[PDB]
Amino acid sequence: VTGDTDQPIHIESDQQSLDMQGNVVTFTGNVIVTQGTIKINADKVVVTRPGGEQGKEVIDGYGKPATFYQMQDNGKPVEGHASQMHYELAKDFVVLTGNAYLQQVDSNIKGDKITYL
């Protein structure tokens, strides 16, 4: 894959409910957010967009245990899971909530209410 985050994110959903203005794009019905070799699985994802700026919305999804699975390109398989997941292109902070367990190659961030300082 070389660079996952360097590639355009794909939100695979069964229900695409796009607001007429674009204020909110609702993704429901088992959503598979894939990025390179990363495969996130949620049930309800709410992407809000004021309208105009593209490439930086807000990957906010919850419902089914949002797992962070990745194919072992380095031989080491990535594994993670939480109740709520969050990813952003600018805010490079994985904010998970509810049984939040995530490790990159060896470790990352784990707990439940992932909060910083």
């Binding site: 355009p8 994110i9 600018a90």
Partner: peptide, 21 residues
């Protein structure tokens, strides 16, 4: 901080279409 985003694309499994935001 430097901002380097990517064209996020919404894909729909029902119709099989991908609409870039």
């Amino acid at each position: 901080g430097s901002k380097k985003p990517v064209p996020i694309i919404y894909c729909n499994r029902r119709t099989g279409k991908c609409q870039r935001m």
